[PDB]
Design a protein around this ligand. Structure first.
Ligand SMILES: CC1=C(CCOP(=O)(O)OP(=O)(O)O)S[C@H]([C@](O)(CCC(=O)O)P(=O)(O)O)N1Cc1cnc(C)nc1N
Ligand SMILES: CC1=C(CCOP(=O)(O)OP(=O)(O)O)S[C@H]([C@](O)(CCC(=O)O)P(=O)(O)O)N1Cc1cnc(C)nc1N
Ligand SMILES: [Ca+2]
Ligand SMILES: [Ca+2]
Ligand SMILES: [Mg+2]
Ligand SMILES: [Mg+2]
Lengths: 844, 840
């Protein structure tokens, strides 16, 4: 029947669109083997088309060298856009464009073979077998320049990293040969440094055929595969906010493009990939779509794909955000460049991620000193019989008569001869002396005033009541706004308001403030209310945003960007780190729900925050707010692991603090934002102490004071206390101070003094010695803490204080909870009995 | 013309009907009589459309056309596109009894403990008849056990109403009156605890075991732990991948919250293991309690996709979005999910759309941030009341019957609550260390015989008929037979001697990690590959058969892991929990990457025994050493594991000889103690010709926590000439010994601490007592001053042994932000400075 045949043609059209990719000739190695007739000339309704013409369009679009996955996309306009661009007769590239593609393949393979000759076996993680990644990346960048965009920022692992640096970003060949030689000048040898395949670079890309230029950057990274992914996103988002493009901009161009490269085993196996993809369309994190390239060489070291993933493709995780996926044959450079341009066009049209799965192979072992035939003999027997993409592409151009055999040979020896001359120039250089690496501490140094005036406090207070017309405030939120106006004019300022006084005053001075984390708009402890929601309409009001406008109506240049994060730690912390790298003038704070969950971001803390300056010269001013304290809420609601951050600390790389007063926290944040130093800040913040009526500050503590790294009891600095009566000195940090002070007051213990160390790192050596010198009759000193003996500040202070200050801390003893495997007990009642034991020992 | 329109409409409902399904309980957002061709049969358009609307546009949103396997798409199509038989009155009354228990348990706790956190299931009650349907369907298939992992939402409710944890025990937790067994160790919060029981079918004649594992607050961190736990139980039952049958008769039932399922990367890493040979469990049943909120955060700020379950499309799992206010549809989808899992041994996901009746926690006000959502929730009758009215309307039950059944359950709880309230109050004491809970009673022999060494050596050459060995692999096999009979045994062979001898004794040995079959440093060759055919040979598997041909009962399970740390370490931890008699080792490619599994180390490995009474014997092998390969190829962060150490929770070692590593592994496998082992293993030292052991070190010795130089124990060295004592651990010993030999420094001695934790206090004192003329002592290490063993040893050695270590000084690299320098040449100059200071 006629109605019967038309319906089966509709099923065939759907079959090619949905599953044609399973039959596309995408694998250059062809490792897998398993991978009527009278109706062809009859016409069918689609316009009317002959079945033969319908099928040829479908086979060409879906079953040649490109496997298209797009029918999983829920937006019909996105499916239609792809359908219309892939189901057409494509215009062949010009001879000039083909010669340009060959010039890039030439550079890619000849760079690798040169290094094989000069530095045999030495680790370089060659791109050989995946040379088409260079004309593919060139096509991405050129298409971004065609759209008139501002910058392309790249993040990538080790595979062909040295090739991308030299042949895409423009890192001088001489500098790459200087790393191989191990002859580093003083600039190159600064800090502790990192391996050659982890370094970054920047340059200007000039269009070969077009009239535009675009900036190209490549960020630094650790060995930890995919860990840089959220860092790239944050870095790009900060550059977009600065250019007033994208989400927090005036134009929707998102004119800074993330280009993210991956390896096949890492893309499927590392969870941070899913966490980063999850940020792609979020208001607080979107970058208008990332261009992903997977260098799918169908191996991970010695591991076969069947042991690396539980899905058909290494890119199947990208289906979580409905991204289109293009699987392309790495031996077809024209198809590779075409997919790269289509991906940029899709990203520009829908501001969403696009994934390119480039199927290729690894010419050599995992690293150039490894033999891959021991574990993959069949794969390497096939690779051995293979002509590279450069030679195959050259033969195609010679066959078409576009270039001659002599021209191709000449261009090869010209590039080889070029490398030899740069190689010999570098070899002639006088050898720099090799010295032990030195601390970066002195590279960045801090009179900085952080006090504000009464008018500033009052303005921030009044902003909380300058509600939009007809705004219905929630009845339990209204007292917070009214109490803040009261605190601003009368004092008794609590921690939550002191934080907003610091951020609000920075905004009024013209600073961009970005604050985020889990339920951070309201605050986990219902304390912040950075955003308030209309009880009747759901409309939002952000009081601190009013501080971005001067009293005369002019802008300050400042802004308040406050968001609820996704439920992530690894990607969220990575993003905020990257954001502060991308905009050093921004105040960037990430808040943990509880300090106990920041161990989910351990790779970012270890590999970027604590060590990036010494390793790469990369600076970040990110703040981590870690709610911390022994309150009887259990082992996962007690500790931000102070001891781990103090262990990681070295070379003045981070500032670590546990403030005990609202005003000292205010001055800490203002010093951090205004010091001109780009170094992370770790703050152990309160929970119950937010509502401790003793933990409040006077107006003069904000207007006539500064950050105090060491604090004495107010009875000695302002009261009638006698320091000479003190025979026992208790040294502590954080909320336990208020419990020790309450016990001293109850028992009138004039023989005991409590000294707080507000800044845990760097140790305030001079301030501590000066403070202790004011108590001449001290006979015994104790470090008092809530935390178990193997936790808190004792593991580092117990070793460092008697060493740095021998005349003050020889014989320093510890008062704490016993050493524990978990950060606390799970029972509130057990916590309470242990807490009272510390207080009784301290005054016993 | 019209037939092609119908085929497009059929495809449209199958592909996208889920976008129009009535799944959200809150609701926040002429040709009909003609026949068409669709076994191939003709059907009226009205019937085609009816079947499609019922299957895809009612209370169930089906996502399955993304599945690449056509037989899986057909299977779902044939079961959803049919006229379903309505549940029986008895089954409906049973569903109502489950909703009654779920809601009345929550409202009871509200009345008695109004100011206490319980993370109520209210607004998601259908989770209980849904989980009951999963477990009952598993019992219908005659399976052995259902193992549950879940977060905080309705946890206390699941424990009481699904697993059978006594109400009296849950009420005693709320009362804060814990008896000595309940108060053991440091413990954890009530909504993190586990339980076990036997589920008896209501209508069928089978029973099935049901367990619920413990977890930390870290949402989704338990996911790989559940998988490993189930895989170990399957291997023991001889079911699944390493079993005689393919029933995979132990089922993982994994619950999640909507914001955590989309946001936590460990979800993707765990899903990635689902069909892997070394990790598959024959499919996990996933339930997302999708209450469309994450604390105060709206879904639009939690994910970048339409559904919270879209990550499960990475493995082509079918996804069923179901209306939480339709308990019959919820139970039906639960049974279909179990049937799919049994048919295809692949994961199934149920996205149960529901709401959170109260605030995030019962003390939080959600109307400050979600006023519109809570104005809608306030006008809603719960699922229990709505289901009751449906059954009364149909005339199956009376108003009085429903009222009586609810009063009885309430009255039942009151009586248990008052009984618990009458109990005498236990004294509250500070928590105590778990160290003494596990101790070896007597001396444990780990030495073997020459026959055992030779047997393992010969196994490397007992190649299958016609096997072509790679030419660079053949010398490894030959050198091992040589080492077995003549000595000079290297580290790589000593490891296989330990595992092979355990297999010969009947032990299950599971070893895995990144490129672990061959070994990162081309040193292991646990699996060898035929140069001509690709066929694999595993020499240690021959040790699972005695010389007489009988089985030993032992087995060698060796795998290349996925490129994961978090899920792989979580899995091996769970595997070791699931089978305490197994030897379970996870190997880091380089110790530097284990920080990717920090949540597992912090929340499970180092603390699970003290927190939950949960024991694991997992081994972590962390390649470590300063060799000039950079900050991410140098350190397994010794200092972090030593900081985490307390209460004898873990054994931490850095052996310097192959024989001592052999004895360490054998002691660990045979001691009967279930406590993790952290080993800092070598890289260059694998091929150090000085770092070899004699046959007698394996056959006539034991593990030594402290090692002296052989010149004093076996040679002509004079301990009395020593005035400087160097204490160290690991490979730096060989560099210090070489410098001493070169300069004939009889005034200097080098003592190795092989076992870093627990500190070998007695052996250290006994050893140092044999050097009476020592005037100065130094702790010497490669690692920067804020790293290695110094941060803990510098503080603990002068305290535990004051007469030996008062005035102990450090020789190391300066304190550093990264674990080393990035330059090989800079590493070398720093390495020589340590050696020059030590002998200066
Ligand atoms: C397991 C592993 C590699 C295999 C990658 O496979 P694929 O993703 O398919 O990429 P490709 O190599 O096929 O292009 S390269 C890398 C290693 O670290 C090298 C890379 C680096 O250090 O920068 P190595 O020194 O252990 O080999 N390595 C160790 C490793 C483990 N775990 C993490 C999180 N990061 C890592 N770098
Ligand atoms: C952010 C967060 C929660 C929101 C969960 O949302 P969803 O996944 O949609 O679940 P549901 O609550 O809607 O069912 S509950 C949990 C917390 O820790 C409670 C749970 C627990 O501690 O076991 P809290 O004490 O901070 O509230 N919390 C903190 C948290 C942060 N990061 C991780 C990895 N784990 C966590 N437990
Ligand atoms: Ca700063
Ligand atoms: Ca053991
Ligand atoms: Mg690869
Ligand atoms: Mg939720």
């Amino acid at each position: 029947s006629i109605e019967d045949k038309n319906a089966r043609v509709i099923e065939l059209i759907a079959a090619y669109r949905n599953r044609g990719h399973l039959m596309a000739d995408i694998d250059p190695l062809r490792l897998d083997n398993t991978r009527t007739l009278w109706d062809l000339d009859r016409e069918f309704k689609v316009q009317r088309k002959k079945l033969r013409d319908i099928l040829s369009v479908l086979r060409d679009a879906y079953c040649r060298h490109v496997g298209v996955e797009y029918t999983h996309i829920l937006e019909p306009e996105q499916q239609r856009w792809i359908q219309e661009r892939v189901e057409t007769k494509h215009d062949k590239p010009t001879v000039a464009e083909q010669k340009y593609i060959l010039s890039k393949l030439n550079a890619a393979e000849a760079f690798e073979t040169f290094l094989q000759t000069k530095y045999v076996g030495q680790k370089r993680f060659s791109l050989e077998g995946a040379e088409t990644v260079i004309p593919m990346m060139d096509a991405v960048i050129d298409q971004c320049a065609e759209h008139g965009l501002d910058e392309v920022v790249i993040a990538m692992p080790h595979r062909g990293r040295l090739n991308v640096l030299a042949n895409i970003v423009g890192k001088p060949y001489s500098q790459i040969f200087s790393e191989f030689e191990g002859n580093l000048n003083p600039s190159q040898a600064h800090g502790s440094g990192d391996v050659k395949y982890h370094l970054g670079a920047t340059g200007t890309y000039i269009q070969m055929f077009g009239d535009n230029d675009i900036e190209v950057s490549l960020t630094a990274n650790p060995s930890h595969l995919e860990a840089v992914d959220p860092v790239l996103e944050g870095l790009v988002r900060a550059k977009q906010d600065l250019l007033d493009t994208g989400e927090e901009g005036s134009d929707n161009r998102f004119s800074v493009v993330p280009l993210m490269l991956h390896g096949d085993a890492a893309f499927a196996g590392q969870g941070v990939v899913a966490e980063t993809l999850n940020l792609a369309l979020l208001r607080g994190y979107r970058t208008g779509g990332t261009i992903h390239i997977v260098v799918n060489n169908q191996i991970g070291f010695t591991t076969a794909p069947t042991d690396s993933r539980s899905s058909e493709y290494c890119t199947d995780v990208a289906k979580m955000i409905g991204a289109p996926i293009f699987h392309v044959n790495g031996d077809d450079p024209e198809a590779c460049a075409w997919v790269a341009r289509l991906a940029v066009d899709f990203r520009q049209a829908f501001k969403k991620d696009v994934v390119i799965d480039m199927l290729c192979y690894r010419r050599r072992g995992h690293n150039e000193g490894d033999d891959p035939s021991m574990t993959q003999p069949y794969m390497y027997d096939v690779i051995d019989t293979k002509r590279g993409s450069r030679k195959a592409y050259t033969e195609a151009l010679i066959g078409r008569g576009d270039i001659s055999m002599k021209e191709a040979e000449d261009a090869l020896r010209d590039y080889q001869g070029q490398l030899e001359r740069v190689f010999n120039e570098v070899r002639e250089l006088e050898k720099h002396e090799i010295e032990p690496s030195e601390s970066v501490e002195a590279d960045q140094q801090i009179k900085l005033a952080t006090a504000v005036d009464k008018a500033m406090l009052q303005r921030i207070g009044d902003a909380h009541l300058a509600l939009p017309e007809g705004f219905t405030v929630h009845p339990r939120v209204r007292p917070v706004l009214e109490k803040r106006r009261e605190m601003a004019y009368e004092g008794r300022i609590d921690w939550a308001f002191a934080e907003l006084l610091a951020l609000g005053s920075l905004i009024a001075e013209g600073k961009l403030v970005r604050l985020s984390g889990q339920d951070t708009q309201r605050g986990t402890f219902t304390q912040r209310h950075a955003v308030i929601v209309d009880r009747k309409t759901g409309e939002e009001f952000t009081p601190l945003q009013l501080l971005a406008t001067n009293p005369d109506g002019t802008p300050t240049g400042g802004k308040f960007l406050v968001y609820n994060s996704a439920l992530s730690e690894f990607a969220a912390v990575g993003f905020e780190y990257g954001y502060s790298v991308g905009n050093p003038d921004a105040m960037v704070l990430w808040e943990a729900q509880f300090g106990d969950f920041v161990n989910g971001a351990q790779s970012i803390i270890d590999e970027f925050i604590s060590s990036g300056e010494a390793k790469w010269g990369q600076l970040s001013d990110v703040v981590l707010l870690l709610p911390h304290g022994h309150e009887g809420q259990g082992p996962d609601h007690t500790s931000g692991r102070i001891e781990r951050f103090l262990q990681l600390w070295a070379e003045g790389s981070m500032t670590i603090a546990m403030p005990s007063t609202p005003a000292n926290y205010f001055h800490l944040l203002r010093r951090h934002g205004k010091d001109g130093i780009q170094r992370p800040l770790i703050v152990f913040t309160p929970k119950s102490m937010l509502r401790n009526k003793a933990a409040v500050s006077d107006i003069r503590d904000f207007t006539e004071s500064k950050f105090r790294s060491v604090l004495e009891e107010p009875m000695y600095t302002d009261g009638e206390g006698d320091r000479n009566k003190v025979t026992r000195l208790l040294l502590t940090s954080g909320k336990i101070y208020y419990e020790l002070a309450a016990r001293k007051a109850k028992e009138n213990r004039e023989d005991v003094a409590i000294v707080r160390i507000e800044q845990l790192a760097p140790l305030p050596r001079r301030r501590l010695a000066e403070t202790l010198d004011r108590y001449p009759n001290v006979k015994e000193k104790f470090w008092v803490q809530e935390e178990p003996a193997n936790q808190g500040a004792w593991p580092s202070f117990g070793l460092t204080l008697p060493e740095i200050l021998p005349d003050h801390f020889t014989g320093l003893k510890r008062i704490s909870r016993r050493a524990m495997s978990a950060p606390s007990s799970g029972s509130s009642k057990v916590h309470a009995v242990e807490q009272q034991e510390i207080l009784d020992t301290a005054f016993g």
